Amino acid sequence: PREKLNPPTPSIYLESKRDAFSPVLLQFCTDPRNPITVIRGLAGSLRLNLGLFSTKTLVEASGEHTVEVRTQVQQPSDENWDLTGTRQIWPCESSRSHTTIAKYAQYQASSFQESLHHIIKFGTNIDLSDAKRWKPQLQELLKLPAFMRVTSTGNMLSHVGHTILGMNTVQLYMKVPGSRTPGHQENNNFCSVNINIGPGDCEWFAVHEHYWETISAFCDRHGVDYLTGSWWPILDDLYASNIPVYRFVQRPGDLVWINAGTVHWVQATGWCNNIAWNVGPLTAYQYQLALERYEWNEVKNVKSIVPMIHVSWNVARTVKISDPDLFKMIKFCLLQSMKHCQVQRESLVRAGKKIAYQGRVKDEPAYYCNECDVEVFNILFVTSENTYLVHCEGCARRRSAGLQGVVVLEQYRTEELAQAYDAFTLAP
Ligand SMILES: O=C(O)CCNc1cc(N2CCc3ccccc3CC2)nc(-c2ccccn2)n1
Ligand SMILES: [Co+2]
Ligand SMILES: [Zn+2]
Known part of the structure; x- marks a missing residue:
């Protein structure tokens, strides 16, 4: 039905700092039935200074910082056209170049004023990992509830022991209208936290993890690599396959929680900046999805950016796990790991x-x-x-x-x- 294929967006409105820190928030965001959650009024409720992530502030902080530019043809969010402009296609190709925050800022600002083209530039993958360079910015994100923070005891990425770029460090995206984030799942199905700094909106699309193999089959049919390629779902294809598609707007100060393994794609409708990082909650649900993508990656010769064996040992060394389902999973992974090392030692010695x-x-x-x-x-x-x-x-x-x-x-x-x-x- 039209009702079932256009499900309402899981949404939370925080009226107070206290509600932001409620245990109810963590259970709602991580509920497997909620593939994506939009938290309205998060920045306001926590008094987050998102001005620290404004283009003006960023330019002053590190104007020469590298920006990975993606050049794209501007098109409506429900369209992706072939070269003839007569049919919809899945592949969504871009050209990759490099510039600075200062130069991208001037382009962003000038296009915004001129509005008051067919081709646009999307400022991607801006690295905010340098703790000294981005001190006020990163300190501001300590105001979030623990489960959402860049670093916390319940986050698997905080038990890696070293930096995993873009996962346990913050990435910044600087956007003009039409700036398009192609469809994907996160590295090893890890959850993601994304905040729109604004001044404009982002439009989001999402599909439950359950349907990922179907989306992968579409990608194969349409000549693009699902795991590593750049693609944009044809909405009519998804609806014809009875796949519900979540659709919503992320306004300035809204936080999007991308739950474990959710397939998602994004387009800037206005001028805005976004910040994002990953979180891996210590739950059976997340751990299972992380390990299955770890195994699938190996099948497909794709690097797992989260080294799950390393991580599982570190977790086991320091974290007390009370959930029997999660404990069993980690215990099994560790036993397999010990056995694999043993087989290698024996053959070397032989x-x-x-x-x-x-x-x-x-x-x-x-x-x-x-x-x-x-x-x-x-x-x-x-x-x-x-x-x-x-x-x-x-x-x-x-x-x-x-x-x-x-x-x-x-x-x-x-x-x-x-x-x-x-x-x-x-x-x-
Ligand atoms: O638009 C937003 O606010 C979120 C952007 N999220 C992105 C953005 C992004 N890129 C910038 C967008 C883009 C645009 C055009 C081509 C390729 C890409 C991929 C890199 N990559 C990833 C990524 C990559 C690997 C694993 C997980 N996530 N995530
Ligand atoms: Co991503
Ligand atoms: Zn090898």
Whole structure:
């Protein structure tokens, strides 16, 4: 029906700072039945100074900061045309270039005044990770309830132990009308927090995680990579497949919570800035979706930007988990991980290959394979290309000389993992 295919937007209006900090808010935002939530009056209720994220303030703060520009043809939010302008298509291609905040600002400001073109420029992926450079901005985001913050005990990304750019650091987007964010799910299905600084609106579209394989099938049919390509759903295709589509406007000061694995796309209707980062709540729902996308990525040779094995061990070492469903999932992941390390050690020892203990140091990143981008946990196959390259076991073995010239390192002895694992118990 027309009613079921156009579901109402899950919405919250905070009348007070107290309601912002209610446990009811966290349960509403993370409810699997709410794929996306818009929190009206969030900035006002928390007295957030969003002026700190105004274009004028940003220019003064770091005018020469790099902006990744996406050049796009301006089109209505429910349209994406082929080159002839006669039919709708899924692929939504852009050109990628670079400029500065100061220069993008002048373009943003000048277009805004002139309104008082066919081709537009979208200022993307602006990196607000530098804690000194963006101190007042980042400090302002400490006013949010804990579950929404960049860093918190209940956020899996706060147990990584190092920076994951754009996930546990804030990204800024500077927009003019028509600036288009193509359809996607977040890295490893992690939740996202997005605030419109404004002065104008953003239009949002979203589909429940449940339907993602159908959207992936459309992408394949229309010649674009679902996981890594740039695409814009044809709404009529979605409706013809009985897929409900959420549609709403995000006004200045409104916070959008993108729940785990929600497929979403966005278009600026006015001139505005957006800020965003990811959160991974420590729930069975989020953890399951994170691990299944982790496994699917490996099938499809796509890098998992969240190193889920590394993360699961860190969580197990420090966090008390009381939910039996989530505990079981983490416990299983850890046991599989120990077994996988063990198989590698045994085959290395059978081959007569030496393993050196390397250990871990503070702030050390998690490693990925240079050839296939898979997470490489604990047992590292290392080659000298000063410059060292890490490989997974398969790719190391595949080298023309096999393991000749490859040094194998171990970052955690069996006993280290066994002791961490044994201490990880279900909390009362
Ligand atoms: O419009 C907004 O306020 C939110 C923008 N969100 C974006 C924006 C964004 N990009 C800027 C938008 C854009 C425009 C045109 C082509 C490609 C892209 C992708 C990079 N990428 C991502 C992304 C990437 C990987 C995993 C998860 N998310 N998210
Ligand atoms: Co995104
Ligand atoms: Zn590999």
